[PDB]
Amino acid sequence: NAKVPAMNKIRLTNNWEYLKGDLGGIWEAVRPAAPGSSEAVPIWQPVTLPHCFNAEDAVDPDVNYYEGPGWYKTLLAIDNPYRNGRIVLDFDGAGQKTDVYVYTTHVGSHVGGYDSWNVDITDAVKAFLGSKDAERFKGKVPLSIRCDNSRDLEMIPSDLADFNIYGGLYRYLNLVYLPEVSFEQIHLESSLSSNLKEGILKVKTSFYNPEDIRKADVTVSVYDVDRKPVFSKTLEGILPLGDQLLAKMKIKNPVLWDVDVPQLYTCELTVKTPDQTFTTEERFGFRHTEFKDKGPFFLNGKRLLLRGTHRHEDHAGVAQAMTEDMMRREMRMMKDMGVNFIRLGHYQQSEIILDLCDELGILVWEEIPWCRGGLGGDVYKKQARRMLANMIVQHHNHPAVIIWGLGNENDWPNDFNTFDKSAIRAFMKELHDMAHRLDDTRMTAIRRCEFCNDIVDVYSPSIWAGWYRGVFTDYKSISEQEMQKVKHFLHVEWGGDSHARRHSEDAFYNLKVPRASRDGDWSESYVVRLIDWHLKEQETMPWLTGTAYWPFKDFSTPVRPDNPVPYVNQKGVVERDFTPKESYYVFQSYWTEKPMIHIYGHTWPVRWGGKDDRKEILVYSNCDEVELFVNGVSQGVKRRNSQDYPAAGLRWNCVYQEGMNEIRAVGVKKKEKKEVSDVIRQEYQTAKWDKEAACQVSLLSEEGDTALVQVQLIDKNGIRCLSSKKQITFEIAGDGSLICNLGTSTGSRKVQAYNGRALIRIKRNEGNSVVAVKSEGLPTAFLELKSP
Amino acid sequence: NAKVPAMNKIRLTNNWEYLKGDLGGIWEAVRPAAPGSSEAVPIWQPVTLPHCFNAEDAVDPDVNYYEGPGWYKTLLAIDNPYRNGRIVLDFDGAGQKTDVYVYTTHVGSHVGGYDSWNVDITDAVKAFLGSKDAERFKGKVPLSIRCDNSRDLEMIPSDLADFNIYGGLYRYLNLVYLPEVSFEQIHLESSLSSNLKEGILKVKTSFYNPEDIRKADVTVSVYDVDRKPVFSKTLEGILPLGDQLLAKMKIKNPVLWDVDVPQLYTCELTVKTPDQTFTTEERFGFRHTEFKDKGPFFLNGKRLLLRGTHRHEDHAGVAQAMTEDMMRREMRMMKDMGVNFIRLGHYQQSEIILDLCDELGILVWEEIPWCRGGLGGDVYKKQARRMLANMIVQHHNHPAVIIWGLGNENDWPNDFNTFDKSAIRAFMKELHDMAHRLDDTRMTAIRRCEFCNDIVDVYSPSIWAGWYRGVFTDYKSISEQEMQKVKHFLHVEWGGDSHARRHSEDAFYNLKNIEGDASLYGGVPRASRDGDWSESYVVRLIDWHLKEQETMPWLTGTAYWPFKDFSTPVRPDNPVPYVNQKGVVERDFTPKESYYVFQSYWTEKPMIHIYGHTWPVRWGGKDDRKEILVYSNCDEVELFVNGVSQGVKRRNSQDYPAAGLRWNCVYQEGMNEIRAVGVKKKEKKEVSDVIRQEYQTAKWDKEAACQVSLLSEEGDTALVQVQLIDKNGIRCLSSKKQITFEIAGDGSLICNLGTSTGSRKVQAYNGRALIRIKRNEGNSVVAVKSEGLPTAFLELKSP
Amino acid sequence: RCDNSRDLEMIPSDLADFNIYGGLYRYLNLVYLPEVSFEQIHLESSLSSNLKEGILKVKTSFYNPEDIRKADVTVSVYDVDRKPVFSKTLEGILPLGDQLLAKMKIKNPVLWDVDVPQLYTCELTVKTPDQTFTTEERFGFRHTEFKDKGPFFLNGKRLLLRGTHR
Ligand code: PRO
Ligand SMILES: [K+]
Ligand SMILES: [K+]
Ligand code: NA
Ligand code: NA
Ligand code: NA
């Protein structure tokens, strides 16, 4: 399968209908139906693409997310601009098994939720438009597509995985018109000498030529980052059939691709016949990479500590159906945090993501979804083989990619009643060998399958210091031991869960030490210190290739119904809606140079303790020195120093006054000659609280048609229970509706309290509603919401 | 099977878990799973059987009912009382495609939602118990079952049908222990001499004998209606393998089975070997039936007008998963209405229903679900052939059954891109020929496929006088024309929708004063479909049909459609969404007004029913003479309005409507008491009825608000009432606006029942709507919405 | 294509003491038919206890691929000398699937015997406006009985079977 190298892609976003469930046969999608008839049910839902079956039910706290069939239908207005041209449906990606129909004709199918693929529907379209059936469709072509994400033990990935195996047309679906002769595949194979002074580019192509044209003229042109030609060659009378090597060239003193200054060349290809001129473009970059034996990673001859994260294709409100603009925002957000490396979750991701990594300067590890459970039969193995080949062939032109991953946690059993380590080793080695045959210039890898750690080029164990294992102060020691076991060690996945907006006084060094092991309270306060510690240690590990935090952004998973946000993995440093957590700024203060400054506690409204306690205040900043003010009184300047943990020396112990406090931080970064500041306001409560006794519910603010409701757990005397984690359940009756099923701690109708509180927004619909608030063992509370 | 065992038959009702959806493979049903693990999801629901996927979502107003896969699982504690015995799973019925697993071993499958079937799991159980995998199940055997009601154009019935194609284990699933030798089938073939004085009974059996036992002693005994022996015979050393004719006997002066006095004989069979004594019972009845060419129907030599209804396997709160007690109540309710004939919807029904028809005296038409759509391929045709053979073979012994139906509305197209009448004719005749090969003693039938009306023994056209066609006063004339087209005419399906508790003044003949002496005017109500779907119209429609039937001596009979409101996927916009409301009984068994019309015509036990028990507020002008109808089988009835006698009237079916028992009376503004006293001379009995009704003379403007109030309480349950009122607070008594209920807090709406008072979205009945709230001893707020009106709120607190 | 390859999942067994022969070794006939014809003709006969009354049931299955709605069918039965003993026409019958065409009683029927084999002939005709099609089928009246632990009787007389194989 391929992504189609085309210039004229039409995204089919509008005028779709979606049915959750199965039809009795293709005839049900296209048969005549009168209003009010038996054919007029089931009732379909109008939607736009991309669309995911699971946009809401993945994080709905009371249901298993839907795994099963669903249908889409639309009417295509066909108008091919090319004489005797082709009509192609090009799928960026669809989950998980897809069948495609033109009227009643099955035209294509696909198994695999994460690779790109396409279907040539030229003949089906011509036959339909020439048939008696075209008339009642008014000259349009009925397109019906079935997607299915039914559970399937003989299909990867496994339902044991810690993520949703989503369904639907959740990546763009494109209508692509082609001339008679086009390119089926374009491989831009480039290499760079060790001394960086000579680049080699090989331009290989496969032709798409169903009309069996015998000759064409093909022009290959290569342009540099400034759009200047560096090579141009026309091949007259070439045979445009199957594979052809078009050009091999040497480029002296190439512009290099780098994570700080990503620079790309552009290859432009034209196919000419008497009846067509067709041009497309493909980008590539020159760069040299090397993993040292028992040592670090080098990019273009310089040691580069990989500063990595992960991401899932998942987002608030849409699940996997993210748009291009959402992807652009998220990747920019990563770059602004200082990320230079990403493992793209457990599957091939949208080509849009790969382009953004090429453009932003982010190295890529990308893997096939052989993720837990063991090993299935022949259909299973063919899928893994097919998805690995599809991934390498589809993404090999991207300079960001340095690692093809072959699987994750393959030592995790129980999708089958046997677990055969030797068979897993055998299939693993077959995939490794196949990847090296397809692309000898990149490394293979796996994560966490020790009995396969001799097979791949690059290996990652499981090291979650301070979360699943020991204390986070063991991080460096464990890494040193682990790195000794394999030729090339690279650490993917570490961190900890934090319930966004939950903070903990016990996690701080308050006067009048905090443990470094999993905070059973899942506070941001603990994860911040855990990340701080990891980043400080990495500055003293010169042998270290690098690491990748897991994940960048909170994402939904079916195996955690009981998390503070149900069905959400909360290890992210960013909320599922892009809202940064406190931990985002720790990475940013360590990994970027643009001046910034962040007092911890922007979402911490009420601290607590004894009167005149000296409360710890942390500032995460890359400034050379910072001065803290508490209620206008300077608390002293402090100099930044990574090794002075925590907060790299920028910590203070200060008395808060009862009631409201204002904390201000002023920083200077000498290199930039820049001053930056931050300010937060925090209340300080000295009253102690008894057991939770009631929910106080009130209107916190309004914006347009929207109301922000706040819930506070209080004891029998009305004192805030600032440590409570009790689950709050929201219900509504009336004209409004809850803004929920977003997978965030402020967009959930069932959510654990954060320091005794919970927030949710109500869409009022310009009418009247009553909100009810439940919590186990407490009286149900109520709030009326009227509109102006 | 059924009824071939008895007491070694265990209903598996408890300790089941249900998953809406599909597993990735049988291993996910039985693999080790620790709490909090990836194996601990998806989360299953504990359930009791019988169970239906669609108990709630069939009538849920905002979703398409679920058609797809679902799984059940339990742990069987097996302890066979018989030496070297069998373990059998016996399905009364499951929808639609079913696969059965013992541990990881697939042991059986079935396509067909309405026939009975079984699987012998002895070997799979033994193989599992002898393996190392048995230990972690602690001596129990994991049983996993997949049911699937996915839409399937190559499977009957068609999704064009006006009923839900339900999914799940919605009839009893029985664990049956058996000895080595038992009966696979018992065929009791009985016939009667022309003078009815001699009965012949042939006892044919098929043996189940997987251990190949060579000889057994088999005893046949027949007991009469008083449980006295009339025949007893032991066959020593018979071969208990395959088919055996066990007995042929003549019973002189047999007690006959009849619709007024249903009387059954019992055949008792015992199979003995050195290691077993196995005894079972099967019932049968002697009766003679005859359809006259271009004439009526005869039971036991006497003309019998078939007084019929229909029923679906569907009920409030459970969809198809009705219990035996629910079925006994419903069939008893039919008999109390005077029914003597039923077409069991569009499919084979539970054997319990057939047993109740035999015991209550209700003749039966039972058909396969070849119901609309055209004709599919080979798998489709094999299913239809198999379901016809299964139905005849499984239900042959029931004396109630007189007709095997081969299909319904087979002229209804569009499940395929072709519709070939000649192919449908060819398959229809093949099914007809097959039924007669299997059972030559009964008639075949179809309903509404004119181009096949030459193939079957008995034919029904489509006659919906006053609902889908013309006026109900054409009923008799249409029936006369239709009966001439075929040798044996039988009319199944007629009636009309009525939104229970919705009544209509315009449906009655009301008298207004026109200004010496004033004169009287009244519009005559139309005899065509009431666009308002009032009970008032259906009552008159039923009344007319039954009156005409007393003057149709050539008529075999008819069957009203249906007895009870039932859910249907093709009517999202009905007053009760997704409910076919043509019943005379609500989906929860509550009688509608129309129930008593049938009862007054069809029974002899004295009864009397004033129309309007669910009509709280009538309306009109101050001195209007409002029509009052009484439906009663009493010879004479006297009406009292507010204590003032309005005169005695004599019953006369042909004095339409109400068989002469109608009055025109002035109501006073406010509350009125209407009392009716009747006497039935034959029984020398007096009976009475009384209703109380308000009378509103104030006219109302457009709907402007919803007035919401707590109408009454019962324990933890609150009955909430909604009343649509105009800008001056006057009740909008003709309003049909849809009302939506919502709740937040500790309580829950008692909704998705498919009744006009158990629905969270429902059209108002005369401007009001009721729903019950389960308060859970806490506090809730109810919101009430209606298009274009301000949303109203009602608080519900607990003590 | 004909094939007599050995096949253990096909009867007879190659263990048998005869050749499982291959080829078109019995006549292959080209048969022209009208629209409506008979697919099967079943002549079911029984003989009274005293041999004096014979019953013949004539059942047929129609071949009717054009779905003709009505036809006229004649049943005729001829004796051993071709003398008619029964004739009846069913006008406007449905020539589709199975039909019982006739049930009749023959008094003092001539019996079939091993010394005097005598056969009746049943003749069936299907007519429409576009066809007249006639075919014939034979049957014989005779009574057989195997006595429990005893000999064989043909038409009430003990007949010792003098048999062979081929
Ligand atoms: O063979 C029959 O038709 C009778 C009817 C009831 C029991 N068996
Ligand atoms: K969920
Ligand atoms: K529904
Ligand atoms: Na899977
Ligand atoms: Na179907
Ligand atoms: Na053989």
Q: A667's torsion region: left (phi>0), alpha (psi -120 to 50) or beta?
A: beta
Q: What angle do CA A533, A535, A538 make, to 5 degrees?
A: 110
Q: By three-state DSSP, how is residue A334 classified?
A: helix
| Angle of helix A351-360 versus helix A378-395 axis, rounded to 10 | 40
Nearest chain B CA: its distance from C35 CA (Å): 14
B23, B29 contact by CB (below 8 A) = yes
Q: By three-state DSSP, how is residue A319 classified?
A: strand
Q: Cβ-count burial of A631 within 10 angstroms (0-12 exposed, 13-18 middle, 19+ buried)?
A: middle
Annotate A666-723 with DSSP letters as a single string. Answer: EEEETTTTEEEEEEEEEEEE-----SEEEEEEEEEEEETTEEEEEEEEEETTS-B-TT
A159, A551 contact by CB (below 8 A) = no
Annotate A586-624 with DSSP letters as a single string. Answer: HHHHHH--S--EEES-TT--EEE-STT-EEEEEEEE--S
Cis upstream peptide for A646 (omega within 30°)? yes
Structure tokens that stand for B80 in this block = 């066979």
Is residue B189 in contact with ligand 1, taking CB distance under 6 Å?
Answer: yes
State the CB neighbour count (10 A cutoff) for residue B642.
13
Give nearest CA residue, ligand 1 atom 4.
B190
In whole angstroms, what is the distance from residue A382 CA to residue A396 CA?
21
| Angle of helix A524-538 versus helix A475-483 axis, rounded to 10 | 50
A401, A366 contact by CB (below 8 A) = yes
B67, B409, B493, B627: the catalytic one is B409
Say how many Å lie between the CA of residue A63 and the centre of ligand 5.
Answer: 28
B330, B311 contact by CB (below 8 A) = yes
Q: Cβ-count burial of A42 within 10 angstroms (0-12 exposed, 13-18 middle, 19+ buried)?
A: buried
B161, B255 contact by CB (below 8 A) = no
Mutate to test the interface with B, among A37, A41, A738 (most CBs of B within 10 A): A41
Is residue B399 in contact with ligand 1, taking CB distance under 6 Å?
Answer: yes
- Segment (H or E) for A143: strand A141-148
Give buried/exposed letters for B704-713 (b at 16+ CB in 10 A, else e).
bbbbbeeeee
The values of phi and psi at residue C120, to 5°, are -90, 160
CA B741 vs. chain centroid, Å, equals 29
State the CB neighbour count (10 A cutoff) for residue B767.
25
- The ligand whose atoms approach the alpha carbon of C15 most closely is 6
Mutate to test the pocket of ligand 1, among B397, B401, B440 (most ligand atoms within 8 A of CB): B397
Continuous H helices in B342-473: 351-360, 378-395, 421-438
Structure tokens that stand for B414 in this block = 């569009």
Going by C-beta distance under 8 Å and a sequence separation of 6 or more, which residues neighbour residue B644?
A: none
In whole angstroms, what is the distance from residue B512 CA to residue B519 CA?
8
Amino acid A141 reads V
Contact flag B162-A22 (C-beta cutoff 8 Å): no
- Token pair 């200047």: residue: A228
Query: How many distinct helices (H) and strands (E) make up chain A?
Result: 9, 46
Strands A198-208 and A141-148 turn out to be: unpaired
B430 contacts chain C (CB < 8 A) = yes
State the CB neighbour count (10 A cutoff) for residue B774.
16
The values of phi and psi at residue A224, to 5°, are -85, -175
Contact flag B429-C69 (C-beta cutoff 8 Å): no
Q: Which residue of C has its CA nearest to B451?
A: C69
CA-based nearest residue to A763, from A707, A721, A710 = A707
Q: Which residue of C has its CA nearest to B431?
A: C97
- Token pair 């030592």: residue: A411
CA distances from B101 to B12, B19, B431, B606 (A): 16, 15, 33, 55
CA B76 vs. chain centroid, Å, equals 32
- Segment (H or E) for B19: strand B16-20
Continuous H helices in A248-403: 324-336, 351-360, 378-395
Q: What was the resolution (in A) of this experimentally determined structure? A: 2.2
- Segment (H or E) for C86: strand C84-93
In the complex, which subunits touch C with 3 or more CB pairs below 8 angstroms? B
Residues 54-73 of A with CB under 8 A from B: 64, 66-69
Continuous H helices in B130-249: none
Amino acid B305 reads L
- Segment (H or E) for B183: strand B182-192
The values of phi and psi at residue A109, to 5°, are -155, 170
| Angle of helix A351-360 versus helix A324-336 axis, rounded to 10 | 30
Longest dimension (CA), chain A: 90
What sign does the CA torsion over B336, B337, B338, B341 have? negative
- Segment (H or E) for B331: helix B324-336
- Token pair 């395959």: residue: B242
CA distances from B496 to A27, B528, B582 (A): 32, 10, 5
The residues pairing with A739 across neighbouring beta strands, listed in sequence order, are A761
- The ligand whose atoms approach the alpha carbon of B60 most closely is 3
B422 contacts chain C (CB < 8 A) = yes
Q: Cβ-count burial of C19 within 10 angstroms (0-12 exposed, 13-18 middle, 19+ buried)?
A: exposed
What sign does the CA torsion over C149, C153, C159, C162 have? negative
- Nearest-Å Rg of the Cα atoms of chain B is 29
Cis upstream peptide for A97 (omega within 30°)? no
Going by C-beta distance under 8 Å and a sequence separation of 6 or more, which residues neighbour residue B627?
A: B508, B509, B510, B511, B662, B663, B664
CA-based nearest residue to B15, from B44, B53, B58, B55 = B44
| Angle of helix B593-602 versus helix B535-549 axis, rounded to 10 | 10
What sign does the CA torsion over B745, B750, B755, B756 have? negative
The residues pairing with A706 across neighbouring beta strands, listed in sequence order, are A703, A763
- Give the length of chain A: 788
The residues pairing with B284 across neighbouring beta strands, listed in sequence order, are B265
State the CB neighbour count (10 A cutoff) for residue C84.
11
A298, A247 contact by CB (below 8 A) = no
Is residue B188 in contact with ligand 1, taking CB distance under 6 Å?
Answer: yes
Amino acid B555 reads L
CA dihedral B581, B583, B584, B588 (to 10 degrees): -80
The values of phi and psi at residue A532, to 5°, are -50, -50
B143, B73 contact by CB (below 8 A) = yes
Give nearest CA residue, ligand 1 atom 5.
B399
B454 contacts chain C (CB < 8 A) = yes
In whole angstroms, what is the distance from residue A87 CA to residue A123 CA?
9
In whole angstroms, what is the distance from residue B617 CA to residue A370 CA?
70
In whole angstroms, what is the distance from residue B367 CA to residue B347 CA?
5
| Angle of helix B475-483 versus helix B535-549 axis, rounded to 10 | 50
B530 contacts chain A (CB < 8 A) = no
In whole angstroms, what is the distance from residue B192 CA to residue A276 CA?
88
Contact flag B27-A161 (C-beta cutoff 8 Å): no
Mutate to test the pocket of ligand 1, among B190, B204, B222, B402 (most ligand atoms within 8 A of CB): B190
CA-based nearest residue to A229, from A249, A204, A258 = A249
B385 contacts chain C (CB < 8 A) = no
Longest dimension (CA), chain C: 58
The values of phi and psi at residue B403, to 5°, are -140, 130
Contact flag B21-A734 (C-beta cutoff 8 Å): no
Query: DSSP state, A508?
Result: S
Give nearest CA residue, ligand 1 atom 1.
B189
- Segment (H or E) for B641: strand B636-641
CA distances from B199 to A723, B249, B250 (A): 86, 8, 6
Which residue of A21, A27, A150 is in closest CB contact with B417?
A27
Mutate to test the pocket of ligand 1, among B398, B402, B436, B438 (most ligand atoms within 8 A of CB): B398
CA-based nearest residue to B433, from B471, B465, B378, B388 = B388
Contact flag C69-B436 (C-beta cutoff 8 Å): no
Say how many Å lie between the CA of residue A561 and the centre of ligand 2.
Answer: 7
Q: Which residues of B touch C44 (CB under 8 A)?
A: none
Amino acid B19 reads L
Contact flag C98-B454 (C-beta cutoff 8 Å): no
Amino acid C131 reads Q
A165, A95 contact by CB (below 8 A) = yes
A260, A338 contact by CB (below 8 A) = no
The residues pairing with B99 across neighbouring beta strands, listed in sequence order, are B109, B146
In whole angstroms, what is the distance from residue B275 CA to residue B266 CA?
26
Q: By three-state DSSP, how is residue B382 classified?
A: helix
Q: By three-state DSSP, how is residue B436 classified?
A: helix
For every residue of B93-144, which 3-state class applies, written as one string? CCECEEEEEECCEEEEEEECCCCCEEEECHHHHHHHHCCHHHHHHCCCEEEE
Cis upstream peptide for A96 (omega within 30°)? yes
Cis upstream peptide for C117 (omega within 30°)? no
In whole angstroms, what is the distance from residue B661 CA to residue B679 CA?
13
Q: B200's torsion region: left (phi>0), alpha (psi -120 to 50) or beta?
A: beta
Q: Which residues of B touch A782 (CB under 8 A)?
A: 744-745, 779, 781
Structure tokens that stand for A578 in this block = 């892009």
CA distances from A30 to A25, A142, B372, B374, B413 (A): 10, 7, 18, 17, 14
Mutate to test the pocket of ligand 1, among B441, B442, B443 (most ligand atoms within 8 A of CB): B441
Query: DSSP state, B66?
Result: P
What sign does the CA torsion over C136, C142, C143, C149 have? negative
In whole angstroms, what is the distance from residue A702 CA to residue B672 CA?
54
Q: Which residues of C touch B432 (CB under 8 A)?
A: 97
CA-based nearest residue to B217, from B188, B246, B242 = B246
CA-based nearest residue to A618, from A592, A595, A580, A644 = A644
Is residue B285 in contact with ligand 1, taking CB distance under 6 Å?
Answer: yes
Going by C-beta distance under 8 Å and a sequence separation of 6 or more, which residues neighbour residue B609?
A: B593, B596, B599, B600, B630, B631, B632, B689
Query: DSSP state, A450?
Result: G
B72, B91 contact by CB (below 8 A) = no
CA dihedral B713, B718, B719, B722 (to 10 degrees): 130
Longest dimension (CA), chain B: 103
CA-based nearest residue to A67, from A96, A108, A91 = A96
Structure tokens that stand for B29 in this block = 């049903």
Strands A614-621 and A651-655 turn out to be: antiparallel
- Token pair 């022009």: residue: A219
Cis upstream peptide for C12 (omega within 30°)? yes
Structure tokens that stand for B643 in this block = 């204590």
Is residue B284 in contact with ligand 1, taking CB distance under 6 Å?
Answer: yes
In whole angstroms, what is the distance from residue A24 CA to residue A17 CA?
17
Which residue of A24, A558, A733 is in closest CB contact with B151?
A24
- Is B409 noted as a catalytic residue in this protein? yes
In whole angstroms, what is the distance from residue B662 CA to residue B627 CA?
7
Q: By three-state DSSP, how is residue B537 classified?
A: helix
**Are chains B and C in contact at 3+ CB pairs closer than 8 Å?**
yes
The residues pairing with B420 across neighbouring beta strands, listed in sequence order, are none
In whole angstroms, what is the distance from residue A447 CA to residue A20 CA?
36
B140, B65 contact by CB (below 8 A) = no
Q: Which residues of A touch B796 (CB under 8 A)?
A: none
- The ligand whose atoms approach the alpha carbon of B154 most closely is 5
The number of C-beta contacts closer than 8 angstroms across A and B is 153
- Segment (H or E) for A127: helix A122-129
Say how many Å lie between the CA of residue A152 and the centre of ligand 3.
Answer: 29
In whole angstroms, what is the distance from residue C162 CA to residue B669 CA?
106
Query: DSSP state, C19?
Result: -
Query: DSSP state, B158?
Result: P
B129, B153 contact by CB (below 8 A) = no
In whole angstroms, what is the distance from residue B142 CA to residue B29 CA?
9
Structure tokens that stand for A577 in this block = 């809606």
State the CB neighbour count (10 A cutoff) for residue B660.
16
In whole angstroms, what is the distance from residue B764 CA to residue B785 CA?
12
A767 contacts chain B (CB < 8 A) = yes
